[PDB]
Structure formats: structure tokens, C-alpha cells
Design brief:
heterodimer, A: about 20 residues, little secondary structure, B: about 220 residues, alpha+beta, 8-stranded antiparallel beta sheet, 4-stranded antiparallel beta sheet, 5 helices, 12 strands, binds 2-oxoglutaric acid, binds chloride ion, binds magnesium ion, binds manganese (II) ion, oxidoreductase, PHD2, HIF-2Alpha
Chain lengths: ~20, ~220
Amino acid sequence: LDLETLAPYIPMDGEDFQL
Amino acid sequence: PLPALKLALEYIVPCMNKHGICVVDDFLGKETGQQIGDEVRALHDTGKFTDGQLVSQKSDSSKDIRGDKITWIEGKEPGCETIGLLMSSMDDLIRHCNGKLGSYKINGRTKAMVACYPGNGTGYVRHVDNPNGDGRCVTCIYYLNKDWDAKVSGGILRIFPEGKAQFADIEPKFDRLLFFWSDRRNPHEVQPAYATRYAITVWYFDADERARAKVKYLTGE
Ligand SMILES: O=C(O)CCC(=O)C(=O)O
Ligand SMILES: [Cl-]
Ligand SMILES: [Cl-]
Ligand SMILES: [Cl-]
Ligand SMILES: [Mg+2]
Ligand SMILES: [Mg+2]
Ligand SMILES: [Mg+2]
Ligand SMILES: [Mn+2]
């Protein structure tokens, strides 16, 4: 089973906050 | 109230490195927790939430996998400033831990996922938050359900930490903060909720893993 089909979505580009 | 430095180094760090799960109760206090609750209820009331989505959408409805409705918050939107304070407080803890959480180098995070299970038996099937290396190393969740009785209303987060002889059952209690490793060490599920259940999640990124994940995305892998 592809566990990515169950994993919660996050945006992959454009939306990361830097600490 | 413990300062961030002591809470991070004397509690969060050793708990994460030994168990991979760490609960901090009464994180912000009742006044702030209630104000966060009001901000979340206003997002809900004004129709901002939409069905939670999955990393890879295939033939089945997202609703077969997760029954929550969500919105993403940066923390500077009008009406969301107390959620922003929560996020800043989570960030301060991570900064004070940084360098001592496993071998991770934490440079950043997602926006906050404000999520609601609207009762009705909704939950989230067994899953891993980051199974394939998308950068996420720490899941941070803040719960804001005043008067939750999990024996009646359900909604327990059950985690199955790798290598342990017991599971971890986390009630979604008001003003509770939770950290856990996002990878395959911590498969988990949200058991059916029979009342409206709110929580705010951020995921923190490991720099090197997140850079690799972005490369894969940008090159179409
Ligand atoms: O609300 C929670 O307790 C956990 C939710 C969850 O597992 C997710 O959204 O990936
Ligand atoms: Cl661990
Ligand atoms: Cl770090
Ligand atoms: Cl599992
Ligand atoms: Mg949104
Ligand atoms: Mg908004
Ligand atoms: Mg029950
Ligand atoms: Mn999850």
C-alpha cells in the first residue's frame, strides 16, 4: 500500500514558513 | 509557568528522544485557550473549512480516509491573531529545542492546519503523517475542546509508537499541546468523534529532508 494515499496533505512549494 | 528554555531542554527534548511523543498540559492557560477556541469557531461559522485532503489522491474519496474539514492559517490574518500567538509559542519551543531533537535540523514549518471533526462518527483512519520523506519531522498539535468527555464523545488520538509494549491514547483535551515524530515510528488514528472536535496542527521540517522533497516535487518525481 502507498502510505501517501493516507497521509495528510501539505503544500509542497510556496508555503513553508522559515523559523 | 515554565520558561521555554526549561520546558524545551528539561522536558520536551528527553521525552521526544526517549519516547517520540510528548504531552504538555495547560500550555497557554484558560483565557488564551478560550480565545483560540472563539477564533476557530468563527472560522467554522463563516464557512472557511473544506474537506481535508491527502498527499496522494487516488480513486477513493478523501472522506473515506479523513472526516475532518480544515483551513490553513498563517497567524497574521484578521481574527486569527491568537492562533498566531499559539504558533509563535510553538515556534519558540522548537527554537529552544533545535539541534537536540534526534539528528534533525529544523528550519521551518507548515502553516497551521485548523481542523474540525464535526461529530457524526467522523475520524481519521490509521496513517503515518510523513511516510515517504516529504520533510516533516515533528507533528505539533494543540487541542481546544472544553468539556470533552472522551468516554462518550470519542475522538481519541491513538498512536502506536514503534517498539513499545503499550499504545499511547491522547484525549483531545482543552489546552493540551502534543508533539510526536511525524515519520513511520508513529502510525496513528483519530477514533470516531461524536461531538465537534477541534485541533490545530503544525508540522516542523528537517532542512535536508525538506530540501530533497522540494527537489523531487520541482523535478516532477
Ligand atoms: O487531531 C488529531 O488528534 C490528529 C489528526 C491527524 O492525525 C492528522 O490530521 O494527520
Ligand atoms: Cl524516539
Ligand atoms: Cl534544529
Ligand atoms: Cl499501523
Ligand atoms: Mg485554506
Ligand atoms: Mg481566513
Ligand atoms: Mg466513544
Ligand atoms: Mn496524522
